[PDB]
Amino acid sequence: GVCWIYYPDGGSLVGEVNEDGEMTGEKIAYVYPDERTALYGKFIDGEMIEGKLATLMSTEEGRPHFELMPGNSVYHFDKSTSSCISTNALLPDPYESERVYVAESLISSAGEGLFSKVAVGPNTVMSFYNGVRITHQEVDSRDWALNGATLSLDEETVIDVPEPYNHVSKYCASLGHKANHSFTPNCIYDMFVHPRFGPIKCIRTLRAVEADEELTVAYGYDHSPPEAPEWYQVELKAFQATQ
Amino acid sequence: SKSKDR
Ligand SMILES: Nc1ncnc2c1ncn2[C@@H]1O[C@H](CSCC[C@H](N)C(=O)O)[C@@H](O)[C@H]1O
């Protein structure tokens, strides 16, 4: 009967597979890593065609029972390209929206930062880092002023949130690019397979975090190639002294 | 590399 297929990050696809063993049907769901928030509806071979926001209320004999959320929030597989970040740049991720918000950073002169909405435990996925997909060659050969929000995805791809999409008034489908740097972070970047964004990275807590605590990540620039923006070099000197 | 987390 029903099958659950988990990703390493804890998200899953669940439903009755078809005669070919594929996640294809009108009652398939992607379930986020809270094992509660779900996108339920039409999938073809595990690709989300029309996922409606739902809550996983219970399971019976392994079968998930959902309640659809009010409204008509629907989502589809919408992987970015080199030039298009999203078909719905202003449509937030529903899992992320209940976990983080953007506000002025507590770090001096650091602009906006990303904050926890609620108290969470260690190993909790908080936020998604989606962006356009460009090459290391393009990124490495341009000035640092353009590389504020670049995140390496793999050996071939860098994810970027370029102007003006680094303003939430123009892009808020994901918010991972809003987390500031710390050499003593409370989060890490981790691999994530998202039903809307595809293979991206996420921000995951490494320890318990309180409500309204700023989320920080080590940006992990090369210290001995330091190939890094000036503010990072300045704080690296500071960090190294406390050691 | 001019990107994070490489
Ligand atoms: N520890 C730190 N100190 C100073 N500036 C920081 C910082 N961590 C991040 N930043 C700033 O944040 C940018 C990366 S994007 C992070 C979100 C950004 N503060 C925003 O308002 O959208 C960097 O270019 C730098 O301007």
Ligand code: NA
């Ligand atoms: Na799950």
